[PDB]
DNA sequence: GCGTGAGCTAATCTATGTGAGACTGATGTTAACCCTAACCC
């Protein structure tokens, strides 16, 4: 229902719905991380929903941005049950950024909006990351410079 | 992704009226208690 509300007119309700959605994902990530992971079904469903949202063209920037943000928040408490899954993370996101908006003289066609979500998401996984691959760090620096 | 202005139809919003539910008190009716034409032993 929150996602359905997010796709609506009367931009005031749109803002309220997106804020509620972001708060709901932030909270659910909080109690997911706050305890030992014994509810992996919810995490799997959330990841599947996020992948479905981001691997199709039917949405505006708001839903893609919120899916990316939720991806970032749930990056944190994913390594507890699935080690080296975080290692998979921080790699797909950077490659996505590189193929999306790393070509100079941006012919993006409305790609700027999703960028701060990318920075928040990559930071979130960065906090709980060990042994940085040290190869994509130039890409991360380029990304931060581009966002600035 | 988002501001900004125009027209519209939905939503009031009070004035006035009408009826349903609760109430209250004056009233008249029935009734307890006793007295009275009249006779006549």
PDB file of C-alpha atoms (C1' of nucleotides) in Angstrom:
ATOM      1  CA  UNK A   1       0.000   0.000   0.000  1.00  0.00           C
ATOM      2  CA  UNK A   2       2.895   2.368   0.702  1.00  0.00           C
ATOM      3  CA  UNK A   3       4.322   1.741  -2.771  1.00  0.00           C
ATOM      4  CA  UNK A   4       0.873   2.215  -4.315  1.00  0.00           C
ATOM      5  CA  UNK A   5       0.553   5.547  -2.505  1.00  0.00           C
ATOM      6  CA  UNK A   6       4.030   6.489  -3.736  1.00  0.00           C
ATOM      7  CA  UNK A   7       2.653   6.231  -7.293  1.00  0.00           C
ATOM      8  CA  UNK A   8       0.011   8.941  -7.073  1.00  0.00           C
ATOM      9  CA  UNK A   9      -0.791  12.502  -8.110  1.00  0.00           C
ATOM     10  CA  UNK A  10      -1.245  15.494  -5.740  1.00  0.00           C
ATOM     11  CA  UNK A  11       2.472  15.844  -5.054  1.00  0.00           C
ATOM     12  CA  UNK A  12       1.852  16.586  -1.367  1.00  0.00           C
ATOM     13  CA  UNK A  13       0.563  13.048  -0.847  1.00  0.00           C
ATOM     14  CA  UNK A  14       3.465  11.859  -3.008  1.00  0.00           C
ATOM     15  CA  UNK A  15       5.971  13.496  -0.653  1.00  0.00           C
ATOM     16  CA  UNK A  16       4.173  12.133   2.404  1.00  0.00           C
ATOM     17  CA  UNK A  17       4.100   8.621   0.927  1.00  0.00           C
ATOM     18  CA  UNK A  18       7.779   8.637  -0.032  1.00  0.00           C
ATOM     19  CA  UNK A  19       8.769   9.943   3.408  1.00  0.00           C
ATOM     20  CA  UNK A  20       6.657   7.254   5.076  1.00  0.00           C
ATOM     21  CA  UNK A  21       8.193   4.580   2.847  1.00  0.00           C
ATOM     22  CA  UNK A  22      11.739   5.708   3.612  1.00  0.00           C
ATOM     23  CA  UNK A  23      10.969   5.789   7.344  1.00  0.00           C
ATOM     24  CA  UNK A  24       9.414   2.315   7.175  1.00  0.00           C
ATOM     25  CA  UNK A  25      12.423   0.791   5.412  1.00  0.00           C
ATOM     26  CA  UNK A  26      14.803   2.569   7.795  1.00  0.00           C
ATOM     27  CA  UNK A  27      12.916   1.266  10.823  1.00  0.00           C
ATOM     28  CA  UNK A  28      12.564  -2.305   9.558  1.00  0.00           C
ATOM     29  CA  UNK A  29      16.275  -2.332   8.739  1.00  0.00           C
ATOM     30  CA  UNK A  30      16.900  -1.094  12.276  1.00  0.00           C
ATOM     31  CA  UNK A  31      15.097  -3.956  13.998  1.00  0.00           C
ATOM     32  CA  UNK A  32      16.513  -6.390  11.434  1.00  0.00           C
ATOM     33  CA  UNK A  33      20.053  -5.387  12.401  1.00  0.00           C
ATOM     34  CA  UNK A  34      19.207  -4.884  16.090  1.00  0.00           C
ATOM     35  CA  UNK A  35      18.861  -8.650  16.632  1.00  0.00           C
ATOM     36  CA  UNK A  36      20.470 -11.870  15.478  1.00  0.00           C
ATOM     37  CA  UNK A  37      19.210 -12.737  12.005  1.00  0.00           C
ATOM     38  CA  UNK A  38      16.547 -15.448  12.283  1.00  0.00           C
ATOM     39  CA  UNK A  39      14.007 -13.961   9.827  1.00  0.00           C
ATOM     40  CA  UNK A  40      15.896 -14.341   6.552  1.00  0.00           C
ATOM     41  CA  UNK A  41      12.613 -14.813   4.664  1.00  0.00           C
ATOM     42  CA  UNK A  42      11.757 -11.121   5.050  1.00  0.00           C
ATOM     43  CA  UNK A  43      15.230 -10.100   3.870  1.00  0.00           C
ATOM     44  CA  UNK A  44      14.962 -12.399   0.849  1.00  0.00           C
ATOM     45  CA  UNK A  45      11.543 -10.980  -0.039  1.00  0.00           C
ATOM     46  CA  UNK A  46      12.808  -7.406   0.311  1.00  0.00           C
ATOM     47  CA  UNK A  47      15.854  -8.104  -1.867  1.00  0.00           C
ATOM     48  CA  UNK A  48      13.676  -9.771  -4.504  1.00  0.00           C
ATOM     49  CA  UNK A  49      11.302  -6.794  -4.519  1.00  0.00           C
ATOM     50  CA  UNK A  50      14.196  -4.339  -4.820  1.00  0.00           C
ATOM     51  CA  UNK A  51      15.754  -6.293  -7.689  1.00  0.00           C
ATOM     52  CA  UNK A  52      12.402  -6.427  -9.468  1.00  0.00           C
ATOM     53  CA  UNK A  53      11.962  -2.678  -9.040  1.00  0.00           C
ATOM     54  CA  UNK A  54      15.452  -1.793 -10.295  1.00  0.00           C
ATOM     55  CA  UNK A  55      15.600  -4.314 -13.176  1.00  0.00           C
ATOM     56  CA  UNK A  56      12.661  -2.895 -15.142  1.00  0.00           C
ATOM     57  CA  UNK A  57      11.549   0.342 -16.766  1.00  0.00           C
ATOM     58  CA  UNK A  58       8.133   1.253 -15.379  1.00  0.00           C
ATOM     59  CA  UNK A  59       8.973   3.792 -12.659  1.00  0.00           C
ATOM     60  CA  UNK A  60       9.980   7.404 -12.180  1.00  0.00           C
ATOM     61  CA  UNK A  61      12.999   8.507 -10.145  1.00  0.00           C
ATOM     62  CA  UNK A  62      11.270   8.327  -6.750  1.00  0.00           C
ATOM     63  CA  UNK A  63      10.582   4.583  -6.632  1.00  0.00           C
ATOM     64  CA  UNK A  64      13.990   3.699  -8.076  1.00  0.00           C
ATOM     65  CA  UNK A  65      15.638   6.000  -5.530  1.00  0.00           C
ATOM     66  CA  UNK A  66      13.733   4.472  -2.614  1.00  0.00           C
ATOM     67  CA  UNK A  67      14.546   0.949  -3.830  1.00  0.00           C
ATOM     68  CA  UNK A  68      18.229   1.900  -4.017  1.00  0.00           C
ATOM     69  CA  UNK A  69      18.070   3.446  -0.544  1.00  0.00           C
ATOM     70  CA  UNK A  70      16.501   0.296   0.887  1.00  0.00           C
ATOM     71  CA  UNK A  71      19.179  -1.750  -0.862  1.00  0.00           C
ATOM     72  CA  UNK A  72      21.748   0.381   0.939  1.00  0.00           C
ATOM     73  CA  UNK A  73      20.134   0.067   4.363  1.00  0.00           C
ATOM     74  CA  UNK A  74      19.763  -3.704   4.043  1.00  0.00           C
ATOM     75  CA  UNK A  75      23.359  -4.022   2.844  1.00  0.00           C
ATOM     76  CA  UNK A  76      24.413  -3.685   6.485  1.00  0.00           C
ATOM     77  CA  UNK A  77      22.621  -6.646   8.084  1.00  0.00           C
ATOM     78  CA  UNK A  78      23.138  -9.132   5.257  1.00  0.00           C
ATOM     79  CA  UNK A  79      26.643 -10.380   6.049  1.00  0.00           C
ATOM     80  CA  UNK A  80      25.511 -11.915   9.356  1.00  0.00           C
ATOM     81  CA  UNK A  81      24.008 -15.040   7.767  1.00  0.00           C
ATOM     82  CA  UNK A  82      25.642 -14.757   4.330  1.00  0.00           C
ATOM     83  CA  UNK A  83      29.347 -14.015   4.610  1.00  0.00           C
ATOM     84  CA  UNK A  84      31.079 -12.666   1.488  1.00  0.00           C
ATOM     85  CA  UNK A  85      27.667 -11.519   0.270  1.00  0.00           C
ATOM     86  CA  UNK A  86      28.727  -8.025   1.339  1.00  0.00           C
ATOM     87  CA  UNK A  87      31.787  -8.631  -0.840  1.00  0.00           C
ATOM     88  CA  UNK A  88      29.367  -9.109  -3.732  1.00  0.00           C
ATOM     89  CA  UNK A  89      27.853  -5.841  -2.539  1.00  0.00           C
ATOM     90  CA  UNK A  90      29.874  -2.633  -2.973  1.00  0.00           C
ATOM     91  CA  UNK A  91      30.727  -4.071  -6.417  1.00  0.00           C
ATOM     92  CA  UNK A  92      27.398  -4.306  -8.233  1.00  0.00           C
ATOM     93  CA  UNK A  93      26.452  -0.797  -7.084  1.00  0.00           C
ATOM     94  CA  UNK A  94      29.707   0.780  -8.261  1.00  0.00           C
ATOM     95  CA  UNK A  95      29.492  -0.965 -11.633  1.00  0.00           C
ATOM     96  CA  UNK A  96      25.898   0.267 -11.919  1.00  0.00           C
ATOM     97  CA  UNK A  97      27.075   3.814 -11.228  1.00  0.00           C
ATOM     98  CA  UNK A  98      29.901   3.465 -13.750  1.00  0.00           C
ATOM     99  CA  UNK A  99      27.631   2.246 -16.537  1.00  0.00           C
ATOM    100  CA  UNK A 100      24.919   4.767 -15.629  1.00  0.00           C
ATOM    101  CA  UNK A 101      26.568   8.164 -15.126  1.00  0.00           C
ATOM    102  CA  UNK A 102      30.338   7.826 -15.479  1.00  0.00           C
ATOM    103  CA  UNK A 103      30.500   8.774 -19.169  1.00  0.00           C
ATOM    104  CA  UNK A 104      31.620  12.379 -19.548  1.00  0.00           C
ATOM    105  CA  UNK A 105      29.322  14.929 -21.207  1.00  0.00           C
ATOM    106  CA  UNK A 106      26.332  13.264 -19.576  1.00  0.00           C
ATOM    107  CA  UNK A 107      23.535  12.290 -21.954  1.00  0.00           C
ATOM    108  CA  UNK A 108      21.795  10.934 -18.884  1.00  0.00           C
ATOM    109  CA  UNK A 109      18.147  11.752 -19.662  1.00  0.00           C
ATOM    110  CA  UNK A 110      17.098  12.242 -16.030  1.00  0.00           C
ATOM    111  CA  UNK A 111      19.662  10.226 -14.095  1.00  0.00           C
ATOM    112  CA  UNK A 112      20.829  12.928 -11.651  1.00  0.00           C
ATOM    113  CA  UNK A 113      18.021  12.285  -9.155  1.00  0.00           C
ATOM    114  CA  UNK A 114      19.132   8.761  -8.230  1.00  0.00           C
ATOM    115  CA  UNK A 115      22.711   9.803  -7.404  1.00  0.00           C
ATOM    116  CA  UNK A 116      22.433  10.785  -3.691  1.00  0.00           C
ATOM    117  CA  UNK A 117      20.664   7.491  -3.063  1.00  0.00           C
ATOM    118  CA  UNK A 118      23.694   5.801  -4.625  1.00  0.00           C
ATOM    119  CA  UNK A 119      26.082   7.654  -2.320  1.00  0.00           C
ATOM    120  CA  UNK A 120      24.025   6.827   0.768  1.00  0.00           C
ATOM    121  CA  UNK A 121      23.728   3.168  -0.239  1.00  0.00           C
ATOM    122  CA  UNK A 122      27.422   2.671  -0.981  1.00  0.00           C
ATOM    123  CA  UNK A 123      28.332   4.442   2.262  1.00  0.00           C
ATOM    124  CA  UNK A 124      26.017   2.170   4.255  1.00  0.00           C
ATOM    125  CA  UNK A 125      27.748  -0.976   2.996  1.00  0.00           C
ATOM    126  CA  UNK A 126      31.104   0.800   3.315  1.00  0.00           C
ATOM    127  CA  UNK A 127      30.740   1.190   7.085  1.00  0.00           C
ATOM    128  CA  UNK A 128      30.473  -2.583   7.652  1.00  0.00           C
ATOM    129  CA  UNK A 129      33.099  -3.557   5.056  1.00  0.00           C
ATOM    130  CA  UNK A 130      36.537  -5.074   5.632  1.00  0.00           C
ATOM    131  CA  UNK A 131      39.431  -5.501   3.183  1.00  0.00           C
ATOM    132  CA  UNK A 132      38.348  -2.885   0.645  1.00  0.00           C
ATOM    133  CA  UNK A 133      38.958  -4.161  -2.923  1.00  0.00           C
ATOM    134  CA  UNK A 134      41.197  -1.074  -3.453  1.00  0.00           C
ATOM    135  CA  UNK A 135      40.468  -1.178  -7.197  1.00  0.00           C
ATOM    136  CA  UNK A 136      37.121   0.651  -7.259  1.00  0.00           C
ATOM    137  CA  UNK A 137      38.234   3.383  -4.843  1.00  0.00           C
ATOM    138  CA  UNK A 138      39.120   5.675  -7.795  1.00  0.00           C
ATOM    139  CA  UNK A 139      35.583   5.048  -9.044  1.00  0.00           C
ATOM    140  CA  UNK A 140      34.141   5.992  -5.646  1.00  0.00           C
ATOM    141  CA  UNK A 141      36.206   9.187  -5.588  1.00  0.00           C
ATOM    142  CA  UNK A 142      35.053  10.023  -9.114  1.00  0.00           C
ATOM    143  CA  UNK A 143      31.463   9.408  -8.029  1.00  0.00           C
ATOM    144  CA  UNK A 144      31.727  11.739  -5.032  1.00  0.00           C
ATOM    145  CA  UNK A 145      33.368  14.417  -7.183  1.00  0.00           C
ATOM    146  CA  UNK A 146      30.613  14.083  -9.788  1.00  0.00           C
ATOM    147  CA  UNK A 147      27.897  14.390  -7.141  1.00  0.00           C
ATOM    148  CA  UNK A 148      29.563  17.491  -5.694  1.00  0.00           C
TER     149      UNK A 148
ATOM    150  C1'  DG B   1      12.011  14.556 -11.130  1.00  0.00           C
ATOM    151  C1'  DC B   2       8.233  20.268 -10.017  1.00  0.00           C
ATOM    152  C1'  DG B   3       6.326  24.778  -9.310  1.00  0.00           C
ATOM    153  C1'  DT B   4       2.323  27.965 -10.752  1.00  0.00           C
ATOM    154  C1'  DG B   5      -2.194  29.893 -12.272  1.00  0.00           C
ATOM    155  C1'  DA B   6      -7.658  28.932 -13.847  1.00  0.00           C
ATOM    156  C1'  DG B   7     -11.893  26.772 -13.690  1.00  0.00           C
ATOM    157  C1'  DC B   8     -14.782  23.530 -11.303  1.00  0.00           C
ATOM    158  C1'  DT B   9     -17.395  20.709  -8.457  1.00  0.00           C
ATOM    159  C1'  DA B  10     -17.393  18.900  -3.750  1.00  0.00           C
ATOM    160  C1'  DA B  11     -17.845  20.384   0.746  1.00  0.00           C
ATOM    161  C1'  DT B  12     -19.523  22.934   3.736  1.00  0.00           C
ATOM    162  C1'  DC B  13     -22.525  26.360   6.912  1.00  0.00           C
ATOM    163  C1'  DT B  14     -25.742  28.896   8.954  1.00  0.00           C
ATOM    164  C1'  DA B  15     -30.992  30.137   9.153  1.00  0.00           C
ATOM    165  C1'  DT B  16     -35.253  28.004   9.679  1.00  0.00           C
ATOM    166  C1'  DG B  17     -38.303  24.331  10.328  1.00  0.00           C
ATOM    167  C1'  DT B  18     -40.007  19.568  12.072  1.00  0.00           C
ATOM    168  C1'  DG B  19     -40.176  15.591  14.765  1.00  0.00           C
ATOM    169  C1'  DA B  20     -38.575  12.073  18.449  1.00  0.00           C
ATOM    170  C1'  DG B  21     -37.270  11.300  23.225  1.00  0.00           C
ATOM    171  C1'  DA B  22     -37.406  12.820  28.120  1.00  0.00           C
ATOM    172  C1'  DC B  23     -39.811  15.240  31.533  1.00  0.00           C
ATOM    173  C1'  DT B  24     -42.943  17.683  34.635  1.00  0.00           C
ATOM    174  C1'  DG B  25     -46.720  19.185  36.922  1.00  0.00           C
ATOM    175  C1'  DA B  26     -51.850  20.436  37.132  1.00  0.00           C
ATOM    176  C1'  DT B  27     -55.859  17.925  37.081  1.00  0.00           C
ATOM    177  C1'  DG B  28     -59.666  15.140  37.575  1.00  0.00           C
ATOM    178  C1'  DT B  29     -60.998  10.577  38.684  1.00  0.00           C
ATOM    179  C1'  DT B  30     -61.623   6.655  41.931  1.00  0.00           C
ATOM    180  C1'  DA B  31     -61.807   5.631  46.362  1.00  0.00           C
ATOM    181  C1'  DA B  32     -61.393   5.447  52.153  1.00  0.00           C
ATOM    182  C1'  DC B  33     -64.333   7.325  55.798  1.00  0.00           C
ATOM    183  C1'  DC B  34     -67.972   9.123  57.689  1.00  0.00           C
ATOM    184  C1'  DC B  35     -72.823  11.621  57.943  1.00  0.00           C
ATOM    185  C1'  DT B  36     -77.583  12.118  56.821  1.00  0.00           C
ATOM    186  C1'  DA B  37     -83.682  12.261  54.664  1.00  0.00           C
ATOM    187  C1'  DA B  38     -87.163   9.207  57.032  1.00  0.00           C
ATOM    188  C1'  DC B  39     -89.756   5.208  60.094  1.00  0.00           C
ATOM    189  C1'  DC B  40     -90.295   3.013  63.246  1.00  0.00           C
ATOM    190  C1'  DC B  41     -89.973   0.214  66.882  1.00  0.00           C
TER     191       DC B  41
END
